[PDB]
Write a protein that binds this ligand. Structure first.
Ligand SMILES: NC[C@H]1O[C@H](O[C@H]2[C@H](O)[C@@H](O)[C@H](N)C[C@@H]2N)[C@H](N)[C@@H](O)[C@@H]1O
Length: 206
């Protein structure tokens, strides 16, 4: 499957793509304002994620640091990134279907639209100003708005026992972006697309 990743933000981001134990395609790249990066993701990829990173510094060996979304100091991510990170999530070719969603379960750093470029399903978007409105206890100094699990590390916020409800903090994310997961047991906002669809991820879509 093809994913086109487009940075429409006025600032540079460093895109990342990983299925947790491995890079997807090159795994990461700098995207200046307006740049597009096209990657190929193997059919059958389960649990893939794409996100943006802000305020990164890398040396010539592709090693360094980012203020949001850092994946152990690497330009090319092999693993998932440190919150806060707005997440485009996907599982491809699962019994003939693709499943896509956007999630704020790991917080929010950059607004995002996640849309199919082929026929047969709709896209999802979280483009509200979550950072500007972020509750004070969730504000990350580096930028972005952390989820409550990352900040407080309780069973209720992390949904550790498999049982948990919504919270004042989850409802904040849900109010600004109803189409994104706001906590682990949120009512699914997953979208079902035809198997082997293609997609575009746009940072700062509006
Ligand atoms: N709070 C301190 C610890 O956890 C943080 O966040 C984790 C974060 O909890 C994971 O969900 C993420 N995938 C990686 C990230 N390292 C920090 N990134 C690390 O400093 C440390 O692992």
């Amino acid at each position: 499957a093809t994913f086109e990743i487009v940075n429409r933000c006025s600032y540079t981001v460093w895109a990342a793509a990983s299925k947790g134990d491995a890079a997807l395609d090159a795994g990461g790249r700098q995207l200046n304002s307006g740049e597009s990066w096209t990657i190929n993701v193997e059919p059958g990829t389960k649990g893939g994620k794409i996100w943006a990173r802000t305020d990164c510094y890398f040396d010539d060996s592709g090693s360094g640091i980012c203020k949001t979304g850092d994946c152990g100091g690497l330009l090319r991510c092999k693993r998932f990134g440190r919150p806060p990170t707005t997440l485009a999530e996907f599982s491809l070719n699962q019994y003939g279907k693709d499943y896509i969603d956007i999630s704020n379960i790991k917080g929010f750093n950059v607004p995002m639209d996640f849309s199919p470029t082929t026929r047969g399903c709709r896209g999802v978007r979280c483009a509200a100003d979550i950072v500007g409105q972020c509750p004070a206890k969730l504000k990350a100094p580096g930028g972005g708005c952390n989820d409550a699990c990352t900040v407080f590390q309780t069973s209720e916020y992390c949904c550790t026992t498999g049982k948990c409800g919504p919270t004042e903090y989850s409802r904040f994310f849900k109010r600004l972006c109803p189409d994104a997961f706001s906590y682990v047991l949120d009512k699914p906002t997953t979208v079902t697309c035809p198997g082997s669809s293609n997609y575009r991820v746009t940072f700062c879509p509006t």
